[PDB]
């Protein structure tokens, strides 16, 4: 049921049966979030979830791709993800295609680019932590002294966090390690997206598009306030289908909206199963 980074949500039969759906975790969550979707897919659809690993998006896909091949061979591959999971699913479709495997479906559940690129600069690192420090002033009713920008500016996202957590530990506050893990992993996993090196894909992608990012995403990164109609994918994906679903990014994975995703996806899986049979 949990084997390394692979969660079994519905086991495939010992032999034969329908094409599995591989789902990839969101930042801060596990693949149990795909249970509602599973309920709106056809009976006996197998489903396996890929849980977090470390590295860049490319490095994470380098860990997943071998495991995908161990599980499902030449194909067909059906890859699905919400939020960061959608970025991970796509990265896997690229890795699999370079190895000549047969990718038939890539379903992105509101995996939408920031409305403009997030600069990877020292100035942007300073601005981002100034915003974060101001929120923390308000929230924890404190004054924050001068941020040690020289220190933070040379560190990766991970380093920036551990530095900030070492400095919070330093004075006063002892945080439950479970709270720290959860906040640190959510934060780093969502930041890994900003430097994804998106490659062109030659197959069909389906983007389930909500109306907007929710407020906490915008707080994390204000460029999520704007989105383009193709969610940023059009330059990389010639064969791009968008399925508007409405609502907010945070709601897209849950009932009732997931009913709309599953209905559409069920027809795509049906077509795939007919094309083999
Ligand atoms: C073509 O290039 C791209 C296409 C798509 C995306 C992309 N796809 O999905 C996302 C995404 O899901 N981003 C995180 C959004 C988020 C969600 C929750 C919280 C959240 O609620 N919180 C943080 C703590 C609370 C924050 C941010 N980005 C990126 C691309 O290039 C980089």
Q: Judge whether 68 and 62 are in contact, CB under 8 Å.
A: no
Tokens of 12: 């495939």
Tokens of 16: 């034969």
Q: Is 188 in the pocket of ligand 1 (CB under 6 A)?
A: no
Question: Residue 107, SS3?
Answer: strand
Q: Is 83 in the pocket of ligand 1 (CB under 6 A)?
A: yes
Strand pairing of 6-10 and 2-3? antiparallel
Query: What whole-number distance in Å separates Cα of residue 277 and Cα of residue 255?
Result: 32
CA-angle at 193, arms to 111 and 113, nearest 5°? 40
Query: What whole-number distance in Å separates Cα of residue 136 and Cα of residue 57?
Result: 29
| CA distance to 56, 145, 255, per residue, from 113 (Å) | 17, 34, 24
Q: Judge whether 21 and 47 are in contact, CB under 8 Å.
A: yes
Question: Hey, whose CA ends up nearest to atom 10 of ligand 1?
Answer: 111
| C-alpha of residue 270 to centroid of ligand 1, in Å | 30
* Sheet hosting strand 47-50, strand order edge to edge: 2-3, 6-10, 47-50, 21-24, 77-82, 103-109, 205-209, 240-244
Positions annotated as catalytic residues are 83
Q: Judge whether 171 and 164 are in contact, CB under 8 Å.
A: no
The boundaries of the domain holding residue 84 are: 4-277
Query: What whole-number distance in Å separates Cα of residue 122 and Cα of residue 107?
Result: 35
Tokens of 3: 């084997």
Question: What's the reported resolution, in angstroms, to a tenth?
Answer: 1.7
Other Cβ atoms less than 10 A from the Cβ of 248: the count is: 16
Torsion of the alpha carbons at 164, 168, 174 and 177, rounded to the nearest 10: -10
Axis-axis angle for helices 157-170, 122-139 (nearest 10): 40
Query: What whole-number distance in Å separates Cα of residue 6 and Cα of residue 51?
Result: 6
Can you tell me which atom of ligand 1 is nearest the CA of 83? 12
Residue matched to tokens 């100034």 = 130
Residues 250, 251, 254, 260, CA torsion sign: negative
Q: How many helices and strands, by DSSP H and E, does the chain display?
A: 9, 8
Domains: count for the chain: 1
Q: Judge whether 112 and 218 are in contact, CB under 8 Å.
A: no
The torsion angles phi and psi of 105, rounded to 5 degrees, stand at: -150, 135
Q: Is the peptide bond before 39 cis (omega within 30 degrees of 0)?
A: no
Query: What whole-number distance in Å separates Cα of residue 225 and Cα of residue 249?
Result: 12
Residues forming a β-bridge with 48: 8, 22
Q: Is 196 in the pocket of ligand 1 (CB under 6 A)?
A: yes
| C-alpha of residue 47 to centroid of ligand 1, in Å | 23
Query: What whole-number distance in Å separates Cα of residue 77 and Cα of residue 55?
Result: 23
């Amino acid at each position: 049921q949990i084997d390394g980074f692979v969660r079994t949500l519905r086991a495939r039969p010992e032999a034969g049966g329908k094409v599995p759906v591989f789902v990839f975790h969101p930042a801060g969550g596990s693949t149990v979030v795909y249970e509602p979707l599973l309920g709106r897919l056809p009976a006996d659809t197998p489903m396996y979830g890929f849980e977090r690993v470390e590295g860049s998006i490319e490095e994470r896909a380098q860990q997943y791709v071998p495991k995908l091949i161990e599980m499902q061979g030449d194909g067909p591959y059906v890859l699905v993800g919400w939020s960061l999971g959608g970025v991970l699913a796509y990265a896997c479709a690229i890795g699999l295609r370079r190895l000549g495997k047969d990718v038939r479906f890539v379903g992105l559940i509101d995996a939408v680019r920031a409305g403009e690129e997030i600069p990877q600069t020292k100035e942007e690192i300073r601005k981002r932590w100034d915003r974060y420090a101001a929120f923390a002033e308000k929230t924890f009713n404190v004054t924050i002294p001068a941020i040690p920008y020289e220190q933070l500016e040379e560190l990766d996202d991970e380093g920036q966090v551990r530095f900030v957590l070492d400095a919070v530990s330093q004075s006063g506050v002892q945080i439950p390690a479970g709270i720290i893990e959860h906040q640190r992993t959510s934060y780093l996993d969502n930041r890994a997206i900003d430097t994804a090196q998106i490659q062109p894909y030659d197959g069909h992608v389906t983007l389930y598009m909500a109306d907007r990012y929710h407020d906490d995403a915008i707080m994390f990164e204000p460029r999520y306030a704007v989105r383009q109609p193709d969610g940023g994918w059009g330059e990389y994906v010639s064969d791009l289908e968008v399925v508007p679903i409405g609502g907010e990014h945070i709601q897209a994975i849950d009932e009732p909206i997931i009913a709309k995703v599953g209905e559409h996806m069920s027809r795509a899986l049906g077509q795939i199963e007919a094309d083999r049979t």
